[PDB]
Structure formats: C-alpha cells, structure tokens
Design a protein around this ligand. Structure first.
Ligand SMILES: O=C(O)C1(CN2C[C@H](CN3CCC(CCS(=O)(=O)c4ccc(F)cc4)CC3)[C@@H](c3cccc(F)c3)C2)CCCC1
Ligand SMILES: O=C(O)C1(CN2C[C@H](CN3CCC(CCS(=O)(=O)c4ccc(F)cc4)CC3)[C@@H](c3cccc(F)c3)C2)CCCC1
Ligand SMILES: O=C(O)C1(CN2C[C@H](CN3CCC(CCS(=O)(=O)c4ccc(F)cc4)CC3)[C@@H](c3cccc(F)c3)C2)CCCC1
Ligand SMILES: [Mn+2]
Ligand SMILES: [Mn+2]
Ligand SMILES: [Mn+2]
Ligand SMILES: [Mn+2]
Ligand SMILES: [Mn+2]
Ligand SMILES: [Mn+2]
Lengths: 317, 317, 317
C-alpha cells in the first residue's frame, strides 16, 4: 500500500535549540525496534541512514538567532534528501533531531507535492520570525520561514537564502497548543491560521478536533498530508524526555487518535518525529517511556489500529 | 430491591493463564471489605462461598492450549453455581480468578436467563478459538466457546463437552479494546460484533459509548444484562496488579461511568470482576490501588453514585 | 480592564477543618509569584493584605460542630473586607484558608452584588447543616449557611448570628462532585440545585458542562459571577497537598477550561482559591505541584489563555 511504503531519514541535528542530546533521537528510535515493528505491520521500509551534518565552526548569531548557518544547511540538505525519498514514491519519515529541521522536511516535501497540507502536533506554534523570537532558538521559528503570508517579514538570515515559502496560512492546522509567545499569538490570529489549542481539545473532544482538521484540509479536494509531530505535543507524563515540555498536554490516547485518523485518510505523504532527547530523562525509564510513545505514535501513522489488524486471509481455516 | 440483591461466588482459579496469583483475587477483594461495603449500600447479600477447584493431574495440553481439563472443569462447576444463584432470584457476582471463568459464568446465567445481553469491558476481545490462539491461554478464548455463530468452528477440547453456545454475535458489546489478535480481529469483523475500541471511546466519549451500548442491547425491550469486567480494561495507572496490562486504557472515571449507567437500567443480572492479580503489584500500594478500583467498580454496579446516595428518610427533620 | 482589576485578600484560617497547615495557603501562593504573574498579564493588582485572625480560647463545640466562634468571626471579618474590595470596583481574590470562609467571601460579595450567581468547584457539596454534619467540620457546611431555602434549618450557632442567607438554590452550580454525604445528597435533590458531579462531567465532557453552567446562570440576564474554587475538585494527581483528596477528580486541563470560560464571560466578580495545605504534600514536589496548579487556575480566571495572549500592538511592525 502507498500508505505503508516508507523512506526513513535520520536527521541527528541539535543546533536549532540549546540542549544537547536531541541528535541521539534517530539512534534511540532505531534501537527501540521501529524498522522491525514497521515491517511486522506489512510496511515496505527503506532506510536512507543518518545525514552527516558536517561541523560549521564559525557560525556567529544573527542578532539573537543562534547557529543560523548550521540550522540553514542542515534543513537545506534535509530538503534534498526528503525530495529524493518523495521522488522514489515513499512516505518520508524524518527522525529528528530538533523541530528546526521542519524547514527542510516540508520545503523538500513541497518540491514534489506543492499542494500539501500540514498538521502540526505540538505544545508550541514554532512560528516566531527571526525578529519576533525571544529565545533566539530556530526550532521555535520553522513555520515563519515556510509561510507565503510572512514574505517580507523574514530578514536575510545566513544559511537561509535557499528558502522560498511553500505553504499558505490556510493549509496548516495546529493541534496541542499551550505555550505560545505573544509575537506568535499575534501572527496566529492575524493570519487566521486554523488551530486547536488544549482549550479547543478540552471543548470539542479529540473526535471533533480530527473531524474538523481533516475537513478543513481535505474538504475542498484530496491532497497529500505532512504530519509534523513534536513529542512535546503530548503531556510530559508520556514524553518526558524532551527539551521544552509543557504541562497539561495531549494524552497517549489522544496522540493515537490523531495518527489513526490521519492513517485512515490514506493521504499521509510525509512525517516528522521530532524533539526526542534521550539525554533529558530524569531516570532511565522516562527515556524508554518517551521513545516507546514516539514509536507507538509512528506505528499508528502506518496502520496500527487499537481495534486490531488482520491480513486478507481466512483465520478460521 | 432486585438491582441490589446479590449472590457472591468466589472463583479462586488461575489455570486459564500462566501467571500465578490471580487465584488470590477473591481473597483480597473480600479482605478489602467488599461484602460489608455492599451491605452498607442497602444490598441484600448472600455469600455462596469460594468454589473448590480440584487439582487435575496429567492435565495435558490440547495442541498449544494449556490446562484444558482444569479450565473446563472450573467453568463447569461455576456454571452450576451461577445457575443456583440465578434460581434464587439474585444477581450472581463472580469474584475471579482469570477470565476463562466467563465460560461458566455466562453459560450458567443463560440457563436461567437465555435472553441475556453481554457487556464485555476489557483491553482484549478474548474471542480466540483453540485453533486461532497464539498464546494458548484459555483466558483469551471464553467468547469463542459461548458464541452460537462459532458452533462447528471450535474443536472438541477435553473438559468442554458440557458447553453449549448460549449467545449470538448480536448479543454482545465490547468496550475498551486495544490489544486484539489478527484472528480475533478477523472474527470480530466477519461476525459483525458491536465494539467500542479505545479509538471509539476517544472519538465518541464514554457518554455516547454507554448511550449506544444500552440502546443496542435494550432498544427492542428490557432484557437481562451480564457485565463481564476484566480489570485490564482500565489503564495500568489504575489497575496495575493484573496479568496482561495494556497502556492507554479506560480511565478510573470511565470505568465508574460504565457501571453507574448499567446500574441505572435496573437490569444488571450477572457480574464478573476478573483478572485481579495481587502478586503482580510492583509495590504493595499498586495492589491496594488495583483492589480499591475493582471494589469501586463493583459498588457502582449496585447503586453507589458519585453525585451521592441517601436513605429514603427526611434528613432535614 | 475590569475583568483584570483585582483585590487580593489573604485569609490564613484553618479552624473550619481539623488538619493544621491550611492557614499557610496565602503565604505559599504569594511566595509562588501570584501577584507578579497577574501583573505580567496586564492586571491591576492591589494587595489588601492578610486578614488578622485573633485566637479564641475556650471555643466549646456546638453539639459536634467544632470551633464555631472562630469560624463565625473569621467569615464575619472576611465579609467586611470583600464588601470593601467590591465597593472599590475590584474583583475580590480570597487566598484560603479552608472553605468555611466562603460564608464570609460570598456574604460580603452579595452585600455589593446581591444578584450574583455562584459556580462551586469542589469534590464536595459543603452543604451540610450544623444538624446534618457527621464530621462536625464547618468547611463542609458553608453552602447551607448561605442558602435562603435552608433558613429555618440552620440552628443558632455561636458566632453566626451576623449571617443572613444571600443565595437561592437556583443561583448556584456545582462542578466536580464525587464525595457527597447522604444528608447533602438529600439537600441537593430536595432543593433541586443544578450540579455537574464527575458522572455528568464524564457523560458530557467539560465543554458541554461549561456551556450548560453558564447558560443556566447567565441565560435569564447578565449577572456577577462568584467562583468558589476548592482545589480538591481536581484529582489528587494534580493537587495532592489538600485536606480532603478524593480519587477520580477533574483533570488539570478541565480546571483550566472551567476558568478560561469563566474569564471569557467578562463577568467574574469574586474568586476564592481554597484548601491549599502546604503541610500535606507527601514530598516537597507534591506541595509545589498543588501550589503551581492553584496559581495556574488563578491566572486563567484573569485572562491567561492556552492559545496564547498578546498586547494591542503590531508585533510584525
Ligand atoms: O520560541 C521558542 O523558543 C518557543 C516558544 N517559547 C515559549 C517560552 C516561554 N514558556 C513560558 C512558560 C514556561 C513553563 C512551562 S511548564 O509547563 O509550566 C513547565 C515548567 C517547568 C518544567 F520543568 C516543565 C514544564 C515554559 C517557557 C519562550 C522562551 C523560552 C526561553 C527564553 C525566552 F526568552 C523565551 C519561547 C517555541 C519553540 C520552543 C519554545
Ligand atoms: O489470547 C491471548 O492470550 C490474549 C490476546 N493476545 C495479546 C498478546 C499480544 N500483546 C501485544 C501487546 C503487549 C502489551 C504492550 S504494552 O501495553 O505496551 C506493555 C508492555 C510492557 C508492559 F510491562 C506493560 C504494557 C501484550 C501482548 C497475544 C500473545 C501473548 C502471549 C504470547 C503470544 F504468542 C501472543 C495474545 C487475550 C487474553 C490476554 C492476551
Ligand atoms: O462534611 C464534610 O466534612 C465533608 C464531607 N465528608 C466526606 C467524608 C466521607 N468520605 C467518604 C469517601 C472517602 C474516600 C475518598 S478516596 O478518594 O477513596 C481516598 C481514600 C484514602 C485516601 F488516603 C485518600 C483518598 C473520604 C471520606 C465525611 C466524614 C468525614 C469525617 C468523619 C465523618 F464522620 C464523615 C464527610 C465536606 C467537606 C470535606 C468533607
Ligand atoms: Mn514544542
Ligand atoms: Mn516544535
Ligand atoms: Mn479478559
Ligand atoms: Mn484482558
Ligand atoms: Mn470545599
Ligand atoms: Mn472539597
């Protein structure tokens, strides 16, 4: 099946944020048995390995924006890799690494399918511009670089001249929001982006959130879907080993519902599994808990259903 | 009152599964004061005691199916006892013991009430046949022995000759499914059984789940309800002292919501409280958490309401 | 804005209940940065300080009712301070303290705004009379002293002659009930008070619960809202440092949802944050979790939103 044909890209990159260890995300996700578990689920899985992100020593800040040439290059190289996987007729599965890699993931995916819709699962909007940012971390800015409506608001940042905005504000849905910067909230409301913060999930229930998200993106016409999943989207009781955890997040069941509903569309075309940082567990079990939840979210993206699964064979004879 | 008139049956049996200690379930539920608490809730309680299960020597497996004669005999004795309690106009309350016992519990109940409707609360379907099973554990096959649609599809297993299928595929509703084998999923779809897996619970909310469940079974006219409750139906954060725990289960709130709604119909006729394993707590608190939850569940089946309860007197006088 | 104009009142009182330490509630809430966080959120914060509760020796019990004179005087003092805060055009914010103080807080609020409607967030109804109580603790009786319908059912208790019932049975909505005494349940049902016990919250979801509460209180016409928040309304996994924790409570997310919806009406006029007991946390982390949750609850009442907030300036300019 097209929805079960995968191209794995490891992107061990941490310089979009300050905490070391997120670069081990591809390693810990593979060691958890992701490839084997995917193959046991009737998936055709090709592993493109981990991208080498050669050191860029001498990468001074652009204003408060840290490591820009390193972040820019990593995303530029990932865009080329994602485009190759997309050309090979596979669902690009990016194992991060920090969320700044979404710049490259979505840009690369958009080169092959320019009509893609984005579902962004995260505690954060990640829509700061290099000028609205207060943390100066590029993993909090990927969405600003990608939006057509923000053209003329993105300054000339070293390492990013290759970027052209590919998604319109109307082609993205956020799910999970609970830690939005003032500057980010201004952008979000002014651009009229469709979002379901934790308030909307509490109000509507995840059932209605998915119904509305999939109608908003696919109601006009069936188009490819890019799911960009930041593990901090789930509550820290499920994915504690992450850089910026925020209280009162999506439950384990809610994360599974999102991905089960996205799978069922048969339109998943690109997936990012980001922000798993195995050096940030408070204990060894918090790390295994984080990686297992990330694996479980991923398997549901490729067909694993809680109601059960069977092959097209007669089990009674 | 009929809905508060009970016959307690201890069923200290474990040989339907490989983990020892589930036979101690009737002991710890009794120790927690289940009987006294029910009597304090205006219930008429008659205790039929704990069934003696004789150790069957040379109980050789049937193909990969472990302990067949032991599981078949325990269910045979339990069917006779449930039928006796049912004949005395009481709600049979089986304290397990592993879920293979539901063969005896439901068969016995159907001998007095053949028009009964089953509600199965569990992470599992337990509908494997001796031929579709992969674990070979009989606590994962009771539904197959009971279904009229699977007559001719169940082999002649030693100890099960007394079994007569007593329920149709249309007479059962599952709630809480999240760990269903491919053969079980195939049976579940091909027979068109009604189920609310964790996916349906997330989509609908337990309110709509219970509305639809009760309308599906009762819509035609009032009929007896058999609730077969496996504590692993609830999330391991509420019932960790169980043999087969599965992540992402029904919350403590949802478990209470199911049972409070069933009580309200006034049609509860048979109840199974299964799979409590006090030797499977990682800490003594995990055992008490499990036992207290299983008691709360049972109390709600017989009238205990979170909004409160009052004796029919004037409290303001 | 008026919905962001606050009058802080500390109420270090514990004699409404038998567990020491709840008088330290205004201290830890202050130490947590409450005032500073409200100011950061564009709030006009005036601190009216901590009320002085003078010791009353030889305060013999009325029948089984403990410390009556102490409770009576504390509420009497609070009523005058809340009435003063209300006349100065500010939302009253009472930092508790045990819930008996609600007598004082609501009576004082009603002196300036008689048409007020109450939303009572708690696991308990706190509607026992001095005659129906079984514990003898006045923190479980505030609602009965405030109700016009129970006028004639409240005996003459030492310290309470100043009390005039200011609310009808129709002007109050309960949210979170799950430990109601038989006497309270009789009161709740006979007076026909509107309530959302955990059962109703499970049935409908917090979204519908809030739509239902507000339509019931504000339907007829716009009126001032008094939110009396007992931290034990939320589950003990979120607010463990409380005197009367009850399992299966409101989630952290439901807590925030209730308060975000109350803020949006723009009609909040009185608030009580009660039963924070920093001496009851099993660990230092259990105290900080209860405190941080209580602080988060308070900020949402004054406009802190999970989708984000921004100032009326152009962030892109
Ligand atoms: O642009 C970005 O970088 C992002 C947006 N961030 C938001 C952050 C503000 N935000 C306030 C609330 C805080 C409390 C969260 S909590 O859930 O109460 C908690 C507390 C302690 C704990 F151990 C665990 C959890 C968490 C931090 C803010 C920032 C962070 C750091 C320097 C700074 F000047 C500005 C910008 C997008 C990409 C990542 C972050
Ligand atoms: O028929 C049966 O026996 C039943 C059905 N199936 C289920 C089981 C497959 N099933 C996958 C998911 C596993 C749980 C994953 S987890 O939730 O992440 C987890 C992990 C570790 C932990 F400590 C706690 C929780 C539990 C195992 C399958 C089986 C079990 C054993 C031998 C075997 F060859 C085949 C049988 C019906 C009655 C009971 C079981
Ligand atoms: O009026 C009042 O004072 C209030 C009403 N209370 C109710 C209390 C009965 N109530 C039953 C359910 C119990 C089980 C709760 S549990 O979640 O299972 C639990 C168990 C153990 C644990 F460590 C923590 C939590 C907790 C106690 C009852 C009482 C308390 C004390 C003497 C007495 F004779 C009668 C009156 C209103 C204001 C506060 C209390
Ligand atoms: Mn994030
Ligand atoms: Mn992110
Ligand atoms: Mn079972
Ligand atoms: Mn089970
Ligand atoms: Mn209270
Ligand atoms: Mn309370």
């Amino acid at each position: 099946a097209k929805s079960r044909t995968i191209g794995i890209i490891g992107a061990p990159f941490s310089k979009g944020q300050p905490r070391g260890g997120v670069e081990e995300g591809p390693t810990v996700l593979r060691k958890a048995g992701l490839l084997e578990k995917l193959k046991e689920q009737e998936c055709d899985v090709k592993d493109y390995g981990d991208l080498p992100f050669a050191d860029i020593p001498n990468d001074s800040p652009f204003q408060i924006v840290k490591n820009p040439r390193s972040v820019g290059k990593a995303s530029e190289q990932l865009a080329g890799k994602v485009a190759e996987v997309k050309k090979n007729g596979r669902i690009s599965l990016v194992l991060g690494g920090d969320h700044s890699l979404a710049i490259g993931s979505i840009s690369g995916h958009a080169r092959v399918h320019p009509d893609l819709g984005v579902i962004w699962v995260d505690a954060h909007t990640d829509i700061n511009t290099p000028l609205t940012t207060t943390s100066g971390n590029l993993h909090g800015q990927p969405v600003s670089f990608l939006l057509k409506e923000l053209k003329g608001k993105i300054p000339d940042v070293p390492g990013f001249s290759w970027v052209t905005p590919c998604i319109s504000a109307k082609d993205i849905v956020y799910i999970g929001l609970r830690d939005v910067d003032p500057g980010e909230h201004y952008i979000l409301k002014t651009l009229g982006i469709k979002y379901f913060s934790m308030t909307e999930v509490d109000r509507l229930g995840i059932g209605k959130v998915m119904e509305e998200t999939l109608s908003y993106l696919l109601g006009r016409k069936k188009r490819p879907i890019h799911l960009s999943f930041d593990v901090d989207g789930l509550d820290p009781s499920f994915t504690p080993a992450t850089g910026t955890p925020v209280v009162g997040g999506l439950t384990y069941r809610e994360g599974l519902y999102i991905t089960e509903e996205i799978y069922k569309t048969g339109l998943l075309s690109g997936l990012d599994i980001m922000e798993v940082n195995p050096s940030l567990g408070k204990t060894p079990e918090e790390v295994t808990r984080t990686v297992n939840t990330a694996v479980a979210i991923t398997l549901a993206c490729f067909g694993l259903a809680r109601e059960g699964n069977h092959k097209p064979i007669d089990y009674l004879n």
